Symmetry: T
């Protein structure tokens, strides 16, 4: 599953970072699909603003998914992003397909956004500790996006009016 590269990151670093990148890739792809799931099916008084907001989140996730995947490839590995892989390697709770109210989707999204945000933020440190600054930076950009999206979601529920 590896290919040769002149990239001189140590071999053990490449192995551990490819694993870490793929773990994050599965999480973020799953979250991308969850985001559209919610976007299509939400109903209630805040429909249009939340509907539109979720498209923005998906667009951001798409960029980070690409950057994460391509990083695994750059350092000699394979990127694993098919449905069969994602369903197995993502730890996100299956997103309910029988919820509709904006509030139910917000609380469901907060759980999952929170899980992915916390994963990616930790992965910054794991990459830094492994000696892979570029990978750490990639997770840092992704984490900034995820922590902002998590805030946009939580801000809707942190007060009731």
């Amino acid at each position: 599953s590896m290919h040769a590269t002149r990239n001189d990151l140590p071999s053990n670093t490449k192995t551990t970072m490819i694993a870490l990148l793929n773990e994050n890739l599965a999480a973020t792809i799953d979250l991308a699909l969850i985001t559209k799931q919610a976007h299509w099916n939400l109903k209630g008084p805040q429909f249009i603003a939340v509907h539109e907001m979720l498209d923005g989140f998906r667009a951001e996730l798409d960029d980070h998914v690409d950057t994460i995947a391509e990083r695994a490839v750059q350092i000699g590995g394979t990127a694993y992003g098919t449905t069969q892989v994602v369903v197995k390697e993502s730890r996100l709770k299956p997103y309910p397909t029988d919820i509709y109210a904006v509030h139910d989707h917000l609380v469901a999204l907060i759980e999952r956004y929170g899980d992915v945000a916390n994963l990616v933020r930790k992965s910054i440190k794991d990459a830094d500790d492994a000696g892979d600054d570029d990978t750490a930076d990639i997770f840092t950009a992704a984490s900034r996006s995820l922590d902002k999206a998590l805030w946009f979601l939580e801000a809707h529920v942190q007060e009731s009016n």
Copy 2:
């Protein structure tokens, strides 16, 4: 799974169309993931042109996925697009995660694109027959995109030089 709408498409036709739209949604989301899987992992002399071409395909699939999903919702149904749904409801063979050569990706992609192209093309007629002209037209837009993408792939292998 249903919500009331003033849309007066006959009730039985809504039911059959929601099912048809979800069948096609599962296929097109799966094909979207497959397209990126190939994009990241392709290697060989035609790397960059094919890499970029596949991003074009993904952007068009994303637009047809949204159109199909929202159509299901418009006529009073639920769009089902989570990883857990897609992995069960897509009939596309799992994309191999251990291929790299551009030619191997082209052959694997032609198989999946051909399957989705033919499914969506048949769905146009199923929708027209059922009396849902907007759904037929949504499938027609999708089919035109799929048949063009299929050609782009096949044109790479229909001659050898």
Copy 3:
């Protein structure tokens, strides 16, 4: 009210389609005016999201108004779009000028959008049966926009939180 054209749609077809286009033209012009009426006067907690949403609807309706009007003219007819014509030939229930609450506008708009959506959707079939495929396609484009707008409105009231 007619002018000569090399367009060889049968004369009966032209006559029936010119009337059908004018019927839809009236309905859509009126819906455009209604849409702005609500946009200006809505008040309540969802003000800005709904206010901006209605501008998007108007922009889409304008494009369909033009397309329907110009089709009547293309096939040798006159397009009837003055206030005096619209107030008589639009079958939309007069929109109230004494409502303000966003909820009240949403409910009223759902009534009006449903009416036009269902008119245009059937008109696809009238045109197709008449053997005017271009006019049927014009109505199909307009119908897709109307069904999506109807959904955007209905989605606000289909759940309560």
Copy 4:
């Protein structure tokens, strides 16, 4: 028909200005519809240039219509812009639906453009006199657009070659 606002314009100025804004709103919406009525149906040697010019006028009118309506609302009033209100409140002579010649449309348009131009220009002074400088400015911007459009029309008939 009123909602309270912190805008400290005196009650009498608010009520007089709301009425004046609504008078001009009805005239400009009607004129907007007239402009497209002519745009669709004009025929003759200068067709394309005039056809396009009238879309320019309509775009400008739309912006002024919005600005006038929204000013009535800002100062605590209701904007009245439905077909039923416009047909009663506009003083423009019903535009003929049985004229085609570019020249005939030019002459008929000049009549109505003249009427609205002169109405809006006078309304600048009425607002200024009422001590509502923002409304006067809104009318000044609309009047500049109207006087320029009137010129564009008249310039076509002021000489014969």
Copy 5:
């Protein structure tokens, strides 16, 4: 002249549609050339507006030419668009190279745009009857453009002032 494709349109449908697409391709390429011929050589008081209008037509034809040619290829065929093919397979009467006055070009264009508009419109139905919904849609888009163009030309001569 054929190449293997996964596209599952029946063999006879492919053969007949490739022929129909090539017939329409020859007519539309010829019409494109005709359009520029007129564009360059027109003279008279309406010169600039008609000159520009005709570039708009050519841009539209170019897009329909490509879509039609590529459809023939997508379904396993060859697209035939060389000068030698077009001069043989177009049925448009050779365009006169010794006319100048805007009126004479408008009349000569009406003849040829009418012929192509009517061919394309009938071809929608031929494609639909053959069970090729994408091809039918391609001709529908092309027909819409052609009927609008025919009107823009005819609208210049349907009245004389």
Copy 6:
């Protein structure tokens, strides 16, 4: 604090307008900061739509701040816009830093937007009476923006659903 200019507005008019401009400059800079204060800290069901609306407000305020400051300079004065000046010359009540609910920020912002809208509106007349028509016009533009923003805010609370 003054510099010579060939601008021949009367000396006493320059002095009184510089003062009036600076008074308005202090209020508008303070309002700009207040607007972002609200934007960052609001929480509740209408979060994203109101968050984004307030960025629109701030962008409009920035342009008017610049225009007011630069006018004071053009006519030979100094623009005073530092935090120390603003905290002393603004009469806006200090914005609470312990509120979060969207409703609470809307009412707080209505207070301050109203205060500024009414100041700027009065300042049009003060400038006109002083014989500085450009300064009056600058205040007119700022006032139209302020009255519209004030409406956007008040419209959220003028009805409860």
Copy 7:
């Protein structure tokens, strides 16, 4: 030199405004040429910044020149803007063609910009006194541009470091 218009500004207002507009038109066209004259021939340490600044000035003048000319024509007059008219009717002192130092051009330009700025500013009031609010407004927009340009010029010489 006059043509008939439905514009109902009083006849004596038209006559006096047409003269005032043409007087301003002459000065502003002259200032436009002067601006470029300086732009081409300036030399010295601040060359590129001042060179580019002067192109910004010319672009704004051009817009006002057109608005002033077209206003004269809209109200039934002739716009006079040929070289022979401008050399006779411009109130500006002929610009020297034998200066080069940036400072020399700045000083010369300040004289000319001051004259035009002061003329246009006065003309706002002359128009307002004549009851022509649109013309007053056109001069206000022009005066705001000229006063700001005058400042940009003077600011370069109001301190020496």
Copy 8:
């Protein structure tokens, strides 16, 4: 009037080319002002098409005016473009300020555009003969624009229908 440059065009070529450039500068500035004069004052059936066309001409002339002037400066000279210089050094017949009919403007413009077109075209050869290829190219770009604009004008009068 000269400043030193490292540009090693021979001194006599500089002197001759500076003179030639200034001759062409005066003609093109004069033609620019003439173009706007016609633009503002034309009246008749072709108003809007020709009005707009003349703005395109003026935009192009502006670019060539700049290029020509700057070339004189680049090779050590002064650019002479004030009203007082242009009225003396342009040999264009003063443009009439008492014509209105579009046909009258077309024919007057044709005479002036013909004069400048033919001057600039000859000047290409004069520059090439003097050994200044860059100046010859500047005149070639200007000449191409002028010959095309001359055609746009002439094409209007070369036929009558």
Copy 9:
């Protein structure tokens, strides 16, 4: 075939340049159609890159075809660009409609691009010699585009790996 123009190129230069331009016009229109023929039908491993490249070539060719044709008209001639003329006046070997391999299209295109590249290059000199500098420059621009396009084609076959 000829119309009067003030363009003072000698009568014999005009005649010979019109013929020369039309010879090049036939070649370049033929090449434009050839480029699309290859674009549609090519197949093999380099498909997408070469497919897209050929669209770039076509766009450049279209611009030069227009410039060549319009130059013929500007100098009082007729542009001849119909299918019947091009098939007669182009000396390009008819393009084969039974080739597919990318390599075969590259070789076939190189023959035709070379022929046109070399005709246009020679035509620069023919125009210079005739004293038509603008026409020479028109051919210089076209020739630069053709020699670049020829290189892009040849570079594909000048090495084998």
Copy 10:
């Protein structure tokens, strides 16, 4: 002043970072107001270049202010950016409102830019030390902008010619 978040940064990291972010927020907002203060009031030979440069700085600061403020909120805190807070928590020496010469502004600005640049650069380390990689990155982006702006300023005074 805290709200709950799923963001799993340690509670002490959140507290510490919210304080640090707010410290930098006060400094950067104060600097933003200082930058415009200079922008408006500067006078001297380098006026327009430095005037424009300072608007570039303010635009960059605005983005960093937003990012810093929002990060404090994301991690469960309150952002404090009112005039009253900034005047108390910014340590920048109050900016003089009685200086004009470009040089004096440059020297004053360097002091304040220096102080903010140095604070923000240190805060990268303080954030790293607290285990908040996203916050550190936010300060890194701000620090890069500040160090660059500081150079732009200092570069004006580091040599005298």
Copy 11:
């Protein structure tokens, strides 16, 4: 070669970082020239795709070159990027000027991109270790670009079909 700055990075950090930035600057400038050398001279079946790809690489390298150079200057140093310096300080093996095949250029480029990629990636850590977070971040962005480009290159040679 140093200038005073308020930037308070420690003196030894400045000296060592200036040297490190200049070592990277020479490598990246050399690589930029190498990239264009390949781009112009490559020949073979993948010409156009690789030709374009290398322009993308060059545009990225230019941005990083500027960032690196400016950082050295910002911290009080001199940026050294002349040909004479680059040829002395780059360690990249001189690029062969006698290769043409795409494959030969790919292999040659991989060697040089690998060297620079590895140098920059190590330099991130050298900067972090010296306590210069902004410089580390600049190298991180550059390293990310380099590692991605290295992959784009290697991906072409990592498989043979």
Copy 12:
């Protein structure tokens, strides 16, 4: 170093123009590096305007470098643009790396821009004499850019205030 082409430029014209193109290529790449060297390191009162001006120069140079290099390759040759070639084949005096003052950079840049401007201008004539009109035109475009850039630089020193 040569590759076969259908380009019919005479053999010795190809050889001599390849040499001449490579001579100018070395000069212009070296000037491009010089321009950036000045850009980064300049300091003094005119810093920002001159800093920015030099990026405009570099962008123009980059386009000419590409056009020159590609021309050499188009006509069958090799483009030589590596650091090792440029250092040997450029005759520009090594640019000083110990200068900072704006004036020092202007003087040094004037020397080198002058040398390159004069080389390229002569090269137009050498290409024309050899019969290569396209190469001559390429040098004409570059010469126009260089003569303009040289002026921009010399205008800063041609007068002292």
